[PDB]
């Protein structure tokens, strides 16, 4: 017992490579990735024309067990918070039922906190670092190919004040917490992008992250299905066929949030937090945080 865990891995790098290799075998496009030059008329930029097919991508809960002469050590501390000496801990043969969901700014169909809202970051001080948020209760986000995603207005405004009850200041006794939206960047980054029913959705979320804190009203989010996307696997671009179904319908459970904080206002009265995402590793990290691989004889 009395062991160490952190914002490093277990299966973060492993899983990432399994999922990248899983997507490849499943959602086949017509790829285009950039290998950089040298000169003299010789300059690569690989384009690949595969028989772009209309398949359906479905998530299979992936269990990660002990790798060779190693052992998985699950931290049982109900509220383990990232890095630190886990007190209550035990060896396990496999982690748990991890659903590999690829998506941005909103972690979906995953593990919730059993106690209170728990946030985690490598360095809560460096504004450049992603802050992951594990939610208390699940929220629903129903979406369709028809361009929209609606989530309960009350359910989500509540989770916001909960997350607000602990931002950057570090569960700060108090100050003004502000939720604004993305500053800019790729479409996959600026919007809640995810793969719904095989298709790629780009849901405009300004309405989820635009507030201030210290009957059947639903939050309707405009959404768009794009065919040309910037890859998350590696720095590339890809194009998929247009939809064939006229009833693309998903129902996911927001289980988290991946944020970022505005800077140049260190320790002052207000702290702005905007949605984030992009590094799919930060998606595996939210599920694998409580695990670690130790060499066994």
């Amino acid at each position, epitope marked *: 017992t009395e062991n160490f865990n952190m914002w490093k891995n277990d299966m973060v790098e492993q899983m990432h490579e399994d999922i990248i290799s899983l997507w490849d075998q499943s959602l086949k496009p017509c790829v285009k990735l950039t290998p950089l030059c040298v000169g003299a008329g010789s300059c690569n930029t690989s384009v690949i*024309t595969q028989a772009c097919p209309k398949v359906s991508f479905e998530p299979i809960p992936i269990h990660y067990c002990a790798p060779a002469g190693f052992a998985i050590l699950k931290c049982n501390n109900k509220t383990f918070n990232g890095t630190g000496p886990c007190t209550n801990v035990s060896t396990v043969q496999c982690t748990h039922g991890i659903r590999p969901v690829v998506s941005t700014q909103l972690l979906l169909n995953g593990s919730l906190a059993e106690e209170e809202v728990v946030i985690r970051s490598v360095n809560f001080t460096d504004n450049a670092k992603t802050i992951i948020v594990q939610l208390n209760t699940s929220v629903e986000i129903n979406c369709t190919g028809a361009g929209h995603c609606n989530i309960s207005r009350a359910k989500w405004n509540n989770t916001l004040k909960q997350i607000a009850s602990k931002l950057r200041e570090q569960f700060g006794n108090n100050k003004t917490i502000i939720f604004k939206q993305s500053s800019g960047g790729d479409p996959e980054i600026v919007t809640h992008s995810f793969n719904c029913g095989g298709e790629f959705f780009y849901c405009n979320s300004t309405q989820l992250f635009n507030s201030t804190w210290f009957g059947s009203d639903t939050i309707t989010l405009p959404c768009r299905i794009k065919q*040309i996307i910037n890859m998350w696997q590696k720095v590339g671009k890809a194009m998929y066929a*247009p939809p064939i179904s006229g009833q693309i319908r998903c129902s996911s459970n927001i289980t988290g949030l991946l944020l970022t904080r505005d800077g140049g206002n260190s320790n002052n009265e207000s702290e702005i937090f905007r949605p984030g995402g992009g590094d799919m590793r930060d998606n595996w990290r939210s599920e694998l945080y409580k695990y670690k691989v130790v060499k066994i004889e």
Partner: antibody
Amino acid sequence: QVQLLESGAEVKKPGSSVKVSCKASGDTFIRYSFTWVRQAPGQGLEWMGRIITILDVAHYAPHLQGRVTITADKSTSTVYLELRNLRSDDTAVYFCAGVYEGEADEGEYDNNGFLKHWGQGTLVTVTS
Amino acid sequence: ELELTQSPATLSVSPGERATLSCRASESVSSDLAWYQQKPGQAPRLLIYGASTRATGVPARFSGSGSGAEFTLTISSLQSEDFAVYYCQQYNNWPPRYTFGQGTRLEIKR
């Protein structure tokens, strides 16, 4: 709605390289994909190839592959078709065509295979 | 590798009457069929696409029907403007290997 205008006629000896242009105007060039259709004197239409103007990836017909090349200059809204190793049988009228997809930083792209706009035609005669 | 064929090589119809041309395929094209009209020395005119949807400025006169490997192009009231050769083109396959038919010649019968 684009307006496709092509280069004048070409007279080439067999074995030469020809590059015909197609100035696209009137509509956001990138949001369209251009194809080249050739037509020999008393024959019909023949698909040679098509370029996806947003990605710059062309897919040619399995018979022209190797000696045909389509490019689009996004700064001059100009499509191109180079045909090398000219055989006398390459003597025909080369039309550039196109349809609208919808991209231009939207990610949308139908990849419509049909052709809505065409050009006046460029006669290319190849003879000794 | 889709081989397209338009059945009546030449169709002779009296002006004002109705005309119907067929376009078969060796493999299934699944609705990705088009129809073009070509006057003598003029670039082709896109009449129909997606097997049955007519293009902007194409009279109800012309009609597109069919799926799989057999299509038809009906022109009810044949005017004089409708003198031309008609071509059908499939574009189902990927990578693109879209093909044309050898055309049907639509002339005036007298």
